[PDB]
Amino acid sequence: SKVRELISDNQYRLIVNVNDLRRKNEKRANRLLNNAFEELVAFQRALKDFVASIDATYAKQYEEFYVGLEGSFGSKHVSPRTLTSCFLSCVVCVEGIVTKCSLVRPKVVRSVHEYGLSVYKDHQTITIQEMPEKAPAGQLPRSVDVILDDDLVDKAKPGDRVQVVGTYRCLPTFRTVLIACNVKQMSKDAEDIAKIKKFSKTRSKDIFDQLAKSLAPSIHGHDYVKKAILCLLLGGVERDLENGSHIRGDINILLIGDPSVAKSQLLRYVLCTAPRAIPTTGRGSSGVGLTAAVTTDRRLEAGAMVLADRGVVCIDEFDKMSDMDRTAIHEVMEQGRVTIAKAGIHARLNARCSVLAAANPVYGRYDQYKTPMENIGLQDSLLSRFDLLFIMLDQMDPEQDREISDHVLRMHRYRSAAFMKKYIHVAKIIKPVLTQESATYIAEEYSRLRSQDSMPVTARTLETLIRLATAHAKARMSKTVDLQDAEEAVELVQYAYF
Amino acid sequence: DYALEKEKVKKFLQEFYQDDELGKKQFKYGNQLVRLAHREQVALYVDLDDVAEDDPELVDSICENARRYAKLFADAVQELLPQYKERQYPAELMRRFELYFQGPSSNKPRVIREVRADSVGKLVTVRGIVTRVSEVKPKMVVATYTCDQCGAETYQPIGRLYLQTRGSRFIKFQEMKMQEHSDQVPVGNIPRSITVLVEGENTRIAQPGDHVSVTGIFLPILRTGFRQVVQGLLSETYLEAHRIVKMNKSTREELRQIAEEDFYEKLAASIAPEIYGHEDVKKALLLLLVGGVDQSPRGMKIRGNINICLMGDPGVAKSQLLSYIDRLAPRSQYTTGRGSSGVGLTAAVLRDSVSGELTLEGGALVLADQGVCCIDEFDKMAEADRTAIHEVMEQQTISIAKAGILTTLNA
Amino acid sequence: DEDLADYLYKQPAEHLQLLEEAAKEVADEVTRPRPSGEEVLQDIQVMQELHMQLYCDRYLCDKVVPGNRVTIMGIYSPQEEEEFRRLAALPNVYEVISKSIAPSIFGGTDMKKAIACLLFGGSRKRLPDGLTRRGDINLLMLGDPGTAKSQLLKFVEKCSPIGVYTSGKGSSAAGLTASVMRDPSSRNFIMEGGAMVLADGGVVCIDEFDKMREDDRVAIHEAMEQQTISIAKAGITTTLNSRCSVLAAANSVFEDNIDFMPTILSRFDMIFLAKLKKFIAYCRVKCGPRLSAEAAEKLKNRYIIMRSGPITVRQLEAIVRIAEALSKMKLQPFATEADVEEALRLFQVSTLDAALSQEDQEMLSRIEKQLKRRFAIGSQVSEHSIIKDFTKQKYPEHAIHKVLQLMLRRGEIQHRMQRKVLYRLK
């Protein structure tokens, strides 16, 4: 039997792949016309013939016998940008971004459009813009939101990028939505591989000391921060924080200096190399990391720290921000989830988002004197909260400044990029898991460094050192840490301390 | 079955007051009826369990149609008066006389998140934590209006016309907010809380923070308005709380082998796992995780308060444990120094839209009636928030001295 | 062809309806399988001001911005070089370039000569890795009015084939950059644009640039830096080319003297007939010039001489554009140190303009003297009054804005407290 597995004690809705779908006939729940309006109700009414044979208890009109029609879809499988009236009232395997979400309710007794004739229905629409991270360098959308029916409502949450297939819910002008049909999380559900396996040999070269420069094309100095820039480029998206949590490896970095002290440029490079990465500068006035609970509409204009989930950001002019944006970042950095609760939008929406940060020498140019904790006035804890706080100090180094303008001009043209991006993907799903021996070497020298910089935090610093060794071995595509991978981090954190 | 069995329920209600001798040669429900016409008791509650023992109709049916079997419970009660009466709607038509509901666990106190499209028209009970105590008003329900050329009383629920109180049908009402218990949310979610519809003698009754009863249930006064449930313009079913009632009070080593060995040895080794030792602190946390609330009668009212401070924040990421504590601690809330105003702990007031004027809603402390109070950055609770603290020294300490409101709430 | 052309001009709307139907008739007679996969039509479909509304919907919705290389795809209801080559041969052409452009009503030669560089500008550098770079130096014209700077900007304007005079503190809803708004009907787009927008590639006579709207100010800072701005809305990937050039005209206000951005005067240089339209274009169209390395030697040496002297770094950059103008004034492959040295003689003035001739270290001391060491809560020490104490302490409104009302930028505790204590108390 192919119809008796539907548990309608549970939610009547089902998941259906196309291979078993074509096997049925009309009125036995097939789909071969792709004429949904007849094909769906006929599917459901076929199911209503299947349930009445399985359980007449399950044969109830208030139960809709809906379905998502999930598997092997393709012919329609595009984005909101790309979801056009050729699919008008067609089931499109929508990939996109669940960012800009809606306000909630049940609906009313849909009578014109058993607890009484016409009960409410648990419902809202939810936005999908096209999947941005593969989207054009520049392009406007014609996107849409999408209906979440009862059992589907509140399934996923804003900021996801997902695999959701359903019916192009157009009205007649030309206004639409989808009704999901069902969600799968592409956000959960994920050729030069062997070439990378050839490239990535330790017999190949030290990629790490290289690659930090192989993507820092236009930067004299800062060779520490390149590796940092790499390291923050590197790192996983999960820590096995059972029944609790701590400092983590998605932690985020601060820098000091001007652009043309490479600030914007580095970010621009981090931006030009921002794969799973959105930026900002400072204030970023567009619901920075918020849903903003948007009036007389209501929308959830889920900000960066929603849009940056499973990502890393660039902040420029970090000092610019509001105190609230100085504040709420502080914890949601820690939580990694965006504690929002006004009249309406209550949540801690995840903030699986690292950052690189930059801002100004306050009222300096040099701004050397004092702890950034008041040298740069975004004062307190945030800084201790941050991964790292490097200063591209404006120290005149004429022997370099000699080189710098030459170093400008070997790039001037008197007359290996994606290679990272193809490296990094393969790296981002590895786990260079523990080694006692490295761990010894880490555990060896933390206390040393902790003691060495005596003349700086056990609950924290180890955890970045952990991640710092990780990026090393992650870039190696190694599956456990090398004692040298555990080493340069100590050098790195030492290079934080020089 | 519903719209046309009017005679039964009237027959039923004609007999159910007669169905026993428990109201002194009358049923208990009829005990009130003579007390009703004599204006002794005016509001009524209903233990629906007594009906299902002989007729689960009007029990399962009201559970299927609260409104109708609410409304139909009334229209019998409407014409049932002359049978016990000591003497459109005639003037007295249950005009100050009211009906509530209660009974078996078929209406278990449900979750603020678990209101539904199914919960429309539903028989509806809830427990949880209270806040948003509005300024009560009286509230008319019927525009006993004037046909001036014609004289005697005329009633609309709704131009040259006047709408005049002398026969109109009023009520004392409020807004309230039930909240989750902070106990059935071992979750990465917000403890939800609800706009509550609040009325009757169950206004002017209770304070925030309480764990309570409800019945969030429709009034008999109208089914839908002029017709069945299908309509074109409709305001919201929110929680029409009937029978709001406090919850004063809802693994043995003798049968098992559990409390025998010292928790004050053992519980350390099974609490604070990530923590890097220093269980010594944990003891007081263990002590506070015990608390001292439930006192013996020696007047030790300060027993409840284990009032600890810990000094310095990236102490092991001691920032973390308060979540661990709250992961342990129900009736518990966390706050931070400069995260919000004192109403992170305290309460304050302004207008609202739905119902109720200037709902006082309160903070963690107002939320923490005998709770567990967990702070970040006690130093940034600058002088304002240094203060009710310095009162909350004294237990039931959220005191007000403002123009319209001058209470204290039970911190 | 013959049976359509003149008809389609006055009567487009039907004789082409025959065509696509005739195409559907042929496409059906092409006798492929014929499901409703019409989306590849727009593949086999191949096989405002320069306002007007134009067909911007289902296939046509949201392709590009306006004023572009006008490929009108639908219908709505040499010997002069030889002169220029002689001018390119011509030695003191620079000065008639300086001065034939010039109403000598006013103007230092250098000041114009920026313009004489400006119109030639830098270049647009499709460089080494993804990232590209400017090619065009910008000018910030402050000082006293009573100059016919209007006429001057209009000189540039009615010199500029690409370039529009802009206003003021805005006008209508086009920005100095890609402002937009809401169609009442569904708010699809209002590509309002901006001042660089109609002038992208040209030059923008920003009148009272200081007096602009703050809406673009948060945006302009970057596309001025970047020659492109991003539409920061919900899911709009588009970032628009702001590759127009500058004529940033405002008054000497009051990089210290910006509304809220005293570095953005970084973004400019230091300012206190149709013959050309034939001339400058071709070299604006051609050149693709560079810089002589031997000048790069002197440059590197010079900047070391200047480093004995970001300013320098971006001055490095600005020079690298300025002398880059000259090769385009000279049709050269690259630029000689004379250009640099002249450009230094151009810029050193601008640096002497950048000079004007002390730190804020006097300020936060005396303010922290005042903010808590005098009085934390600030009562009696308020901006109703202490303004006078600032008038005594010579800390003007701009300066207290430079410090005091950005001491709250520092997270200054008792000050930002005071910002709310004396929000009403004073």
Side-chain angles (χ1 to χ4, degrees), chain B residues 319-352:
Chain B
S319 54
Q320 174 51 231
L321 51 109
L322 302 162
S323 188
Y324 191 103
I325 299 309
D326 294 307
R327 265 196 299 284
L328 265 295
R331 321 201 65 264
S332 70
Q333 181 144 63
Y334 177 69
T335 49
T336 68
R338 261 277 54 85
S340 31
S341 177
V343 288
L345 290 64
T346 77
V349 182
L350 280 105
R351 280 71 61 210
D352 299 71

mmCIF file of all heavy atoms in Angstrom, chain B residues 319-352:
data_model
loop_
_atom_site.group_PDB
_atom_site.id
_atom_site.type_symbol
_atom_site.label_atom_id
_atom_site.label_comp_id
_atom_site.label_asym_id
_atom_site.label_seq_id
_atom_site.Cartn_x
_atom_site.Cartn_y
_atom_site.Cartn_z
ATOM 1 N N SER B 319 28.616 35.344 33.644
ATOM 2 C CA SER B 319 27.541 35.755 32.769
ATOM 3 C C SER B 319 26.668 34.599 32.297
ATOM 4 O O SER B 319 25.483 34.813 32.026
ATOM 5 C CB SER B 319 28.151 36.478 31.564
ATOM 6 O OG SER B 319 29.140 35.689 30.918
ATOM 7 N N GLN B 320 27.202 33.382 32.199
ATOM 8 C CA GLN B 320 26.465 32.309 31.567
ATOM 9 C C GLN B 320 25.470 31.718 32.525
ATOM 10 O O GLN B 320 24.314 31.475 32.174
ATOM 11 C CB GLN B 320 27.431 31.225 31.103
ATOM 12 C CG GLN B 320 26.782 29.954 30.543
ATOM 13 C CD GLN B 320 25.751 30.234 29.465
ATOM 14 O OE1 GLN B 320 24.624 29.746 29.531
ATOM 15 N NE2 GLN B 320 26.136 31.017 28.463
ATOM 16 N N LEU B 321 25.911 31.507 33.734
ATOM 17 C CA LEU B 321 25.189 30.626 34.627
ATOM 18 C C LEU B 321 23.837 31.132 34.963
ATOM 19 O O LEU B 321 22.938 30.339 35.182
ATOM 20 C CB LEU B 321 25.889 30.447 35.918
ATOM 21 C CG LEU B 321 26.259 31.773 36.527
ATOM 22 C CD1 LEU B 321 25.463 32.120 37.717
ATOM 23 C CD2 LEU B 321 27.648 31.719 36.662
ATOM 24 N N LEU B 322 23.657 32.428 34.984
ATOM 25 C CA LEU B 322 22.348 32.952 35.301
ATOM 26 C C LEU B 322 21.308 32.390 34.353
ATOM 27 O O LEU B 322 20.178 32.098 34.753
ATOM 28 C CB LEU B 322 22.394 34.470 35.274
ATOM 29 C CG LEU B 322 23.415 35.083 36.251
ATOM 30 C CD1 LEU B 322 23.759 36.521 35.906
ATOM 31 C CD2 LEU B 322 22.901 35.010 37.683
ATOM 32 N N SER B 323 21.724 32.090 33.133
ATOM 33 C CA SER B 323 20.867 31.332 32.247
ATOM 34 C C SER B 323 20.767 29.913 32.747
ATOM 35 O O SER B 323 19.681 29.332 32.792
ATOM 36 C CB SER B 323 21.419 31.373 30.828
ATOM 37 O OG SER B 323 20.511 30.808 29.896
ATOM 38 N N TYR B 324 21.890 29.367 33.183
ATOM 39 C CA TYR B 324 21.889 28.054 33.795
ATOM 40 C C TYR B 324 21.009 28.085 35.016
ATOM 41 O O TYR B 324 20.262 27.146 35.301
ATOM 42 C CB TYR B 324 23.303 27.641 34.174
ATOM 43 C CG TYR B 324 23.445 26.210 34.583
ATOM 44 C CD1 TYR B 324 23.988 25.265 33.736
ATOM 45 C CD2 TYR B 324 23.063 25.814 35.839
ATOM 46 C CE1 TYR B 324 24.114 23.964 34.133
ATOM 47 C CE2 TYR B 324 23.186 24.536 36.240
ATOM 48 C CZ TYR B 324 23.709 23.603 35.393
ATOM 49 O OH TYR B 324 23.831 22.303 35.830
ATOM 50 N N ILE B 325 21.075 29.187 35.736
ATOM 51 C CA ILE B 325 20.256 29.328 36.909
ATOM 52 C C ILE B 325 18.825 29.379 36.478
ATOM 53 O O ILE B 325 17.989 28.610 36.941
ATOM 54 C CB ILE B 325 20.647 30.599 37.675
ATOM 55 C CG1 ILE B 325 22.109 30.573 38.142
ATOM 56 C CG2 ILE B 325 19.679 30.843 38.834
ATOM 57 C CD1 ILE B 325 22.492 29.344 38.870
ATOM 58 N N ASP B 326 18.550 30.224 35.507
ATOM 59 C CA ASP B 326 17.199 30.309 34.998
ATOM 60 C C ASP B 326 16.837 29.042 34.275
ATOM 61 O O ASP B 326 15.658 28.687 34.181
ATOM 62 C CB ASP B 326 17.048 31.502 34.076
ATOM 63 C CG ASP B 326 17.206 32.821 34.796
ATOM 64 O OD1 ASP B 326 16.514 33.031 35.814
ATOM 65 O OD2 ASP B 326 18.026 33.649 34.349
ATOM 66 N N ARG B 327 17.837 28.323 33.785
ATOM 67 C CA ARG B 327 17.542 27.017 33.235
ATOM 68 C C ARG B 327 17.143 26.103 34.355
ATOM 69 O O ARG B 327 16.278 25.237 34.193
ATOM 70 C CB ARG B 327 18.738 26.450 32.502
ATOM 71 C CG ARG B 327 18.744 26.694 31.003
ATOM 72 C CD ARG B 327 19.740 25.790 30.295
ATOM 73 N NE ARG B 327 21.115 26.011 30.741
ATOM 74 C CZ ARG B 327 21.873 27.049 30.388
ATOM 75 N NH1 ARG B 327 21.413 27.995 29.577
ATOM 76 N NH2 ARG B 327 23.111 27.142 30.853
ATOM 77 N N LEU B 328 17.734 26.319 35.509
ATOM 78 C CA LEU B 328 17.218 25.685 36.697
ATOM 79 C C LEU B 328 15.987 26.393 37.188
ATOM 80 O O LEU B 328 14.981 25.753 37.491
ATOM 81 C CB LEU B 328 18.256 25.697 37.798
ATOM 82 C CG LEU B 328 19.152 24.472 37.971
ATOM 83 C CD1 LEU B 328 18.353 23.242 38.400
ATOM 84 C CD2 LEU B 328 19.922 24.215 36.697
ATOM 85 N N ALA B 329 16.018 27.693 37.193
ATOM 86 C CA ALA B 329 15.137 28.430 38.049
ATOM 87 C C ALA B 329 13.845 28.747 37.315
ATOM 88 O O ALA B 329 13.874 29.483 36.325
ATOM 89 C CB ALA B 329 15.785 29.710 38.525
ATOM 90 N N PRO B 330 12.714 28.200 37.734
ATOM 91 C CA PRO B 330 11.440 28.709 37.281
ATOM 92 C C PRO B 330 11.028 29.837 38.194
ATOM 93 O O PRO B 330 11.658 30.102 39.218
ATOM 94 C CB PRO B 330 10.536 27.514 37.468
ATOM 95 C CG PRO B 330 11.073 26.938 38.694
ATOM 96 C CD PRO B 330 12.473 27.301 38.848
ATOM 97 N N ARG B 331 9.938 30.486 37.822
ATOM 98 C CA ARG B 331 9.525 31.711 38.477
ATOM 99 C C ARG B 331 10.644 32.742 38.450
ATOM 100 O O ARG B 331 10.764 33.593 39.325
ATOM 101 C CB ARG B 331 9.106 31.415 39.905
ATOM 102 C CG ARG B 331 8.352 30.115 40.028
ATOM 103 C CD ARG B 331 7.494 30.040 41.295
ATOM 104 N NE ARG B 331 6.402 31.021 41.323
ATOM 105 C CZ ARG B 331 6.432 32.212 41.926
ATOM 106 N NH1 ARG B 331 7.510 32.644 42.573
ATOM 107 N NH2 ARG B 331 5.363 32.995 41.868
ATOM 108 N N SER B 332 11.454 32.661 37.406
ATOM 109 C CA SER B 332 12.752 33.305 37.386
ATOM 110 C C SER B 332 12.851 34.168 36.146
ATOM 111 O O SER B 332 12.317 33.831 35.087
ATOM 112 C CB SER B 332 13.869 32.262 37.407
ATOM 113 O OG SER B 332 13.933 31.548 36.182
ATOM 114 N N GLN B 333 13.543 35.290 36.292
ATOM 115 C CA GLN B 333 13.748 36.190 35.172
ATOM 116 C C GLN B 333 15.123 36.806 35.299
ATOM 117 O O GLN B 333 15.640 36.968 36.407
ATOM 118 C CB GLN B 333 12.678 37.278 35.109
ATOM 119 C CG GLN B 333 12.867 38.233 33.927
ATOM 120 C CD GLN B 333 11.572 38.703 33.288
ATOM 121 O OE1 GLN B 333 10.760 39.367 33.917
ATOM 122 N NE2 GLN B 333 11.380 38.358 32.022
ATOM 123 N N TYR B 334 15.696 37.120 34.152
ATOM 124 C CA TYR B 334 17.007 37.695 34.043
ATOM 125 C C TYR B 334 16.889 39.096 33.508
ATOM 126 O O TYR B 334 16.024 39.382 32.681
ATOM 127 C CB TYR B 334 17.851 36.856 33.115
ATOM 128 C CG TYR B 334 19.223 37.367 32.858
ATOM 129 C CD1 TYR B 334 20.170 37.358 33.855
ATOM 130 C CD2 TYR B 334 19.599 37.791 31.598
ATOM 131 C CE1 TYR B 334 21.451 37.793 33.626
ATOM 132 C CE2 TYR B 334 20.884 38.228 31.349
ATOM 133 C CZ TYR B 334 21.808 38.226 32.370
ATOM 134 O OH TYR B 334 23.092 38.650 32.141
ATOM 135 N N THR B 335 17.756 39.964 33.991
ATOM 136 C CA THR B 335 17.818 41.321 33.510
ATOM 137 C C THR B 335 19.255 41.774 33.566
ATOM 138 O O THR B 335 20.145 41.066 34.047
ATOM 139 C CB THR B 335 16.921 42.263 34.320
ATOM 140 O OG1 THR B 335 17.164 42.082 35.721
ATOM 141 C CG2 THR B 335 15.452 42.016 34.011
ATOM 142 N N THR B 336 19.462 42.967 33.045
ATOM 143 C CA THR B 336 20.767 43.565 32.965
ATOM 144 C C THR B 336 20.679 44.986 33.470
ATOM 145 O O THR B 336 19.605 45.587 33.512
ATOM 146 C CB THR B 336 21.324 43.551 31.536
ATOM 147 O OG1 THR B 336 20.560 44.435 30.715
ATOM 148 C CG2 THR B 336 21.271 42.154 30.923
ATOM 149 N N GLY B 337 21.835 45.499 33.878
ATOM 150 C CA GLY B 337 21.972 46.845 34.395
ATOM 151 C C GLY B 337 21.327 47.898 33.529
ATOM 152 O O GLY B 337 20.346 48.526 33.931
ATOM 153 N N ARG B 338 21.903 48.132 32.358
ATOM 154 C CA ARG B 338 21.452 49.200 31.485
ATOM 155 C C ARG B 338 20.792 48.687 30.259
ATOM 156 O O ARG B 338 20.989 49.228 29.182
ATOM 157 C CB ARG B 338 22.671 50.031 31.068
ATOM 158 C CG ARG B 338 22.852 51.305 31.870
ATOM 159 C CD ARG B 338 21.978 52.424 31.327
ATOM 160 N NE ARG B 338 20.578 52.023 31.233
ATOM 161 C CZ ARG B 338 19.712 52.096 32.239
ATOM 162 N NH1 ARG B 338 20.103 52.556 33.420
ATOM 163 N NH2 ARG B 338 18.457 51.709 32.065
ATOM 164 N N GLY B 339 19.999 47.645 30.407
ATOM 165 C CA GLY B 339 19.341 47.066 29.261
ATOM 166 C C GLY B 339 18.005 47.719 29.041
ATOM 167 O O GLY B 339 17.569 47.909 27.908
ATOM 168 N N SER B 340 17.343 48.066 30.130
ATOM 169 C CA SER B 340 16.049 48.715 30.034
ATOM 170 C C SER B 340 15.882 49.657 31.216
ATOM 171 O O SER B 340 16.828 49.858 31.980
ATOM 172 C CB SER B 340 14.947 47.651 30.038
ATOM 173 O OG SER B 340 15.327 46.509 30.792
ATOM 174 N N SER B 341 14.674 50.225 31.422
ATOM 175 C CA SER B 341 14.418 51.057 32.586
ATOM 176 C C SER B 341 14.109 50.177 33.795
ATOM 177 O O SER B 341 14.128 48.944 33.723
ATOM 178 C CB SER B 341 13.258 52.014 32.316
ATOM 179 O OG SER B 341 12.950 52.779 33.468
ATOM 180 N N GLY B 342 13.838 50.831 34.930
ATOM 181 C CA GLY B 342 13.433 50.102 36.124
ATOM 182 C C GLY B 342 12.303 49.122 35.880
ATOM 183 O O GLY B 342 12.225 48.083 36.538
ATOM 184 N N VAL B 343 11.447 49.406 34.897
ATOM 185 C CA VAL B 343 10.382 48.489 34.539
ATOM 186 C C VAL B 343 10.882 47.221 33.871
ATOM 187 O O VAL B 343 10.079 46.339 33.563
ATOM 188 C CB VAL B 343 9.313 49.161 33.643
ATOM 189 C CG1 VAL B 343 8.482 50.151 34.453
ATOM 190 C CG2 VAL B 343 9.937 49.828 32.407
ATOM 191 N N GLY B 344 12.188 47.099 33.637
ATOM 192 C CA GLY B 344 12.773 45.777 33.592
ATOM 193 C C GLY B 344 12.518 44.987 34.855
ATOM 194 O O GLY B 344 12.471 43.754 34.810
ATOM 195 N N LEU B 345 12.330 45.673 35.973
ATOM 196 C CA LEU B 345 12.020 45.098 37.263
ATOM 197 C C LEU B 345 10.693 45.584 37.812
ATOM 198 O O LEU B 345 9.882 44.772 38.270
ATOM 199 C CB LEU B 345 13.125 45.458 38.241
ATOM 200 C CG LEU B 345 14.515 44.814 38.084
ATOM 201 C CD1 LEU B 345 15.206 45.202 36.780
ATOM 202 C CD2 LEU B 345 15.413 45.166 39.266
ATOM 203 N N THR B 346 10.437 46.885 37.689
ATOM 204 C CA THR B 346 9.338 47.653 38.252
ATOM 205 C C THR B 346 8.204 47.739 37.230
ATOM 206 O O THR B 346 8.179 46.946 36.273
ATOM 207 C CB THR B 346 9.855 49.018 38.691
ATOM 208 O OG1 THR B 346 10.026 49.853 37.541
ATOM 209 C CG2 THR B 346 11.174 48.892 39.432
ATOM 210 N N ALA B 347 7.289 48.690 37.421
ATOM 211 C CA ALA B 347 6.131 48.835 36.554
ATOM 212 C C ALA B 347 5.852 50.299 36.259
ATOM 213 O O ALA B 347 6.303 51.199 36.969
ATOM 214 C CB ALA B 347 4.900 48.185 37.184
ATOM 215 N N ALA B 348 5.115 50.517 35.170
ATOM 216 C CA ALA B 348 4.776 51.848 34.693
ATOM 217 C C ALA B 348 3.554 51.739 33.800
ATOM 218 O O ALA B 348 3.057 50.642 33.531
ATOM 219 C CB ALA B 348 5.934 52.495 33.937
ATOM 220 N N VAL B 349 3.050 52.889 33.367
ATOM 221 C CA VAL B 349 1.677 53.003 32.906
ATOM 222 C C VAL B 349 1.582 53.956 31.730
ATOM 223 O O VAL B 349 2.193 55.030 31.740
ATOM 224 C CB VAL B 349 0.757 53.502 34.019
ATOM 225 C CG1 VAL B 349 -0.688 53.570 33.506
ATOM 226 C CG2 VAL B 349 0.910 52.635 35.202
ATOM 227 N N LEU B 350 0.752 53.587 30.760
ATOM 228 C CA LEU B 350 0.288 54.463 29.697
ATOM 229 C C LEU B 350 -0.904 53.807 29.013
ATOM 230 O O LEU B 350 -1.269 52.668 29.312
ATOM 231 C CB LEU B 350 1.344 54.778 28.640
ATOM 232 C CG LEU B 350 2.407 55.834 28.915
ATOM 233 C CD1 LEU B 350 3.785 55.277 29.219
ATOM 234 C CD2 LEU B 350 2.484 56.745 27.773
ATOM 235 N N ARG B 351 -1.506 54.551 28.095
ATOM 236 C CA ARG B 351 -2.702 54.113 27.389
ATOM 237 C C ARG B 351 -2.445 52.846 26.585
ATOM 238 O O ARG B 351 -1.302 52.510 26.269
ATOM 239 C CB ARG B 351 -3.181 55.222 26.456
ATOM 240 C CG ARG B 351 -3.970 56.326 27.151
ATOM 241 C CD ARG B 351 -3.097 57.191 28.026
ATOM 242 N NE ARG B 351 -2.065 57.863 27.253
ATOM 243 C CZ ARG B 351 -0.868 58.205 27.710
ATOM 244 N NH1 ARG B 351 -0.455 57.868 28.931
ATOM 245 N NH2 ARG B 351 -0.052 58.854 26.894
ATOM 246 N N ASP B 352 -3.527 52.142 26.263
ATOM 247 C CA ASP B 352 -3.498 51.017 25.336
ATOM 248 C C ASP B 352 -4.719 51.139 24.432
ATOM 249 O O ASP B 352 -5.602 51.970 24.663
ATOM 250 C CB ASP B 352 -3.458 49.680 26.081
ATOM 251 C CG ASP B 352 -2.232 49.539 26.964
ATOM 252 O OD1 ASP B 352 -2.157 50.234 28.001
ATOM 253 O OD2 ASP B 352 -1.341 48.733 26.623
#
